[PDB]
From a paper:
CRL2^VHL^ assembles from VHL, adaptor proteins EloB and EloC, the scaffold protein Cul2 and the RING protein Rbx1. From a structural point of view, the VHL protein (short isoform pVHL19, 18 kDa or long isoform pVHL30, 24 kDa) is the substrate receptor of the pentameric 150 kDa CRL2^VHL^ E3 ligase. The largest component of this assembly is Cullin 2 (Cul2, 87 kDa) which serves as a flexible scaffolding protein. VHL is recruited to Cul2 via the adaptor proteins Elongin C (EloC, 12 kDa) and Elongin B (EloB, 15 kDa). The RING box protein 1 (Rbx1, 12 kDa) enables the recruitment of E2 conjugating enzymes.
Here, we determine a cryo-EM structure of the Cullin 2 RING VHL (CRL2^VHL^) ligase dimerized by the VHL homo-PROTAC CM11, wherein one CRL^VHL^ acts as the ligase and a second VHL as the neo-substrate. We were curious to explore the ternary complex mediated by CM11, a homoPROTAC which dimerizes and degrades VHL. The molecule, developed and disclosed in 2017 by Maniaci *et al.*, consists of two copies of VHL ligand VH032 connected by a PEG_5_ linker. Towards this goal, we expressed and purified the Cul2-Rbx1 scaffold component, and incubated it with VCB to form the pentameric complex VHL-EloC-EloB-Cul2-Rbx1, using the short pVHL19 isoform given that the N-terminal residues 1-54 are predicted to constitute an unstructured flexible tail. The resulting sample was applied to copper Quantifoil R1.2/1.3 grids, which were plunge-frozen on a Vitrobot Mark IV and imaged on a Glacios 200 kV with Falcon 4i. Subsequent data collection of 7,216 movies and image analysis resulted in a 7 Å resolution structure (**Figure S2**). We also noted that only three lysine residues are present on VHL: of these, one is inaccessible at the interface with Elongin C and Cullin 2, and the other two are located on alpha helices furthest from the dimerized Cullin C-termini, mapping to a non-ubiquitinable ‘dark face’ on VHL as modelled in our structure. Given that CM11 indeed degrades VHL, we sought to rationalize how ubiquitin transfer could occur in this complex. Interestingly, at the 2D class level from the cryo-EM dataset, we observed some particle stacks which deviated from the 3D consensus volume, suggesting conformational heterogeneity in the sample and thus more opportunity for VHL ubiquitination than suggested by the structural model (**Figure S4**). Our model shows how CM11 folds on itself to mediate VHL dimerization, and how the PEG_5_ linker must cover a long distance to allow for the two VH032 units to achieve their ‘crossed’ relative conformation (**[Fig fig1]**).
Author numbering:
A (entry chain J): 17 to 45, 58 to 111
B (entry chain C), C (entry chain H): 62 to 76, 78 to 202
D (entry chain I): 4 to 222
E (entry chain F), F (entry chain D): 1 to 59, 61 to 88, 90 to 103
Write the structure that this text describes.
Amino acid sequence: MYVKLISSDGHEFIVKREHALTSGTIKAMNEVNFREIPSHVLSKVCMYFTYKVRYTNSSTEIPEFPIAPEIALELLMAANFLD
Amino acid sequence: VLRSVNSREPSQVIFNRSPRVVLPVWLNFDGEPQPYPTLPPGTGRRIHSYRGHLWLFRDAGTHDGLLVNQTELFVPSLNVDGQPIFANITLPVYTLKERCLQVVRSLVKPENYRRLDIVRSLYEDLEDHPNVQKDLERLT
Amino acid sequence: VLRSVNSREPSQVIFNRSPRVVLPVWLNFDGEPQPYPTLPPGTGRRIHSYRGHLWLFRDAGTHDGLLVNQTELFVPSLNVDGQPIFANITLPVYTLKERCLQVVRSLVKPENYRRLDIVRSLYEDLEDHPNVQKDLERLT
Amino acid sequence: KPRVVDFDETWNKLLTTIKAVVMLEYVERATWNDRFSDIYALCVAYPEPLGERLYTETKIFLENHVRHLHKRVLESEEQVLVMYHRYWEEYSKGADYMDCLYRYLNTQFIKKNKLTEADLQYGYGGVDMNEPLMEIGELALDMWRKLMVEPLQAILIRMLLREIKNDRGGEDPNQKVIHGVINSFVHVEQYKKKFPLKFYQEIFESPFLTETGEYYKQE
Amino acid sequence: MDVFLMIRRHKTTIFTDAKESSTVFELKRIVEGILKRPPDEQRLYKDDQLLDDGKTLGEGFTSQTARPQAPATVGLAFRADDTFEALIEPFSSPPELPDVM
Amino acid sequence: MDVFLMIRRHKTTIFTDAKESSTVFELKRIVEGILKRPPDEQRLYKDDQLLDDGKTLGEGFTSQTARPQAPATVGLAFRADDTFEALIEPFSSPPELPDVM
């Protein structure tokens, strides 16, 4: 099952509902629009969900969650926005 | 309260599965912390310790918390068949907020924290670093 | 060659009298250097070692050579009346050349050494970032 | 890119959903798509959060929503059992949907700025502008307690005690209303970690044991 | 082994995990569950390469190339009646780093 | 305790150590031995302060203020008849720090 997340630049991200619900904020907010989250941040938010899901309590050693510095600041906003 | 049991019974341990420079810290017989030699990413060390001794692991630079054997604290048990105990050190599930904050504490010098374009509480979250002593009150 | 003897006979030692952060190194049974926990300016530790084990001391930032009891190397002895052996760690009286090189080495990023208004051999002097393995070779 | 949205869009849409709040269709689908897209844009609006302006008008609206509901119960003191309770439900279901929706404001603005209730009681401040900067659901329930339960308590208690005394006498009073009114005394302090049942015990249970004793003593 | 993807088509993107052993067609069913478009109306690409319905995602989507934290792109092009639209509005670029970073 | 000094007079400087307990006059004997000028014809200053012959160097030359590596200045003024010339050409200033420093 899925939900739709739409970036500020109108990119629509469709993700596993469960992956989306990871966010306290998304739980708060099924086609969410993010007028303040452009598609590069949102895609990485989705990568973080995918990452958190796949590596949360996984037998394979946990690689660091790579974050690009430029998006680190916007993604920090999205992280602080999303929680 | 969290002060190592003076058993004097040896226990060998094998100590890092994280992208951190692990700092092992021992809590002494009186409860005061003592730092031990650091372990780079992927490195092993065979070390000598003792039964009922309280170990914890941090990042050596930024003081962040790191897990050992998927838990926050480690104690050596008995070396059954003479085999050294394994201490598999890994990253915890850090929040998306903190995974971002790590990054902010590492780029900006503390003096410029109150100059950032954010509400007061996010300054007060920046200035409350991974203080080990406050985690000992949490563990107590 | 230079390596700790596996005597298995214990010794207690007191380990700083400098304005530097000291890094102790133990030379293992195989002769390979294993670093131990640092001592900040003026600090002490009482430590446990063994008779015929080989210790030396460097700086924690620059890898500079430091003295222990005026000698470059230290070896634990038998604890007469149970009293811990005193390892008084100090600076040497460096050459004024080496003292000037330290200051330049620690301030300037290495890529820019070949960019400095000095004679060519001083680049070669600067580019010895005081190598411990070379000093093991020197002492051999 | 992280940006600012003005409170007028976010808030009045919010206000509408906090009034419509008796239902969660607008939470599950409309708040995911529409409602939160407005308020989330603003809550930690990139250059400055209008989360403070939003919290203030949200609180004033909740106070006015609760006072509108309170008025309807203050004159309708018999209805105190039905209406102070059912209004507690519409508004508290609201506090829940408000908090589904508001989990962003609640987390990103309110909790980051949230001074502890002890800090505000012993002389410190910067949250209790008009009610403490609590989660909207906690704020809603705090407002319900302060504006609905606390003023109507003597009537609510008296009626419940009479209806139950009549039940002991063999009459069949409205059981669902009675249970719901009683549950409201419990939920209005559910946010207090030190004693989530104190209000219910002092305000309802103590009077209730007393009237029950007098009933069985006579029986 | 889980393979983490971004199924991208013009302004569409699908963040989802699928198995390394799963097929392109099964991914199109997932996309159907998502965009309400049937698989025959979908062309999936591994990044921008057209994938056949019977191919496994492993046949370059591997758990370590299609990673959770760095998912591979699965191009998607929908079929407008008989043919597929041209294969991805890229994601927007981030702003420049402030001097202090 | 040894007190390390720079007995400076105009362009002249004498680097020497003396005891904290030694006297100004004994220092003037050291200077006499060096500059061939008798002590009465010398006015010594602790840094720039005029010192009396019978005073110990400690009375501000202490081993930790007149240190080997940071000697105190002992001003010296030579005698113009009954009087001392005006008391030290300072040492030259260093060039500006290179940007890399």
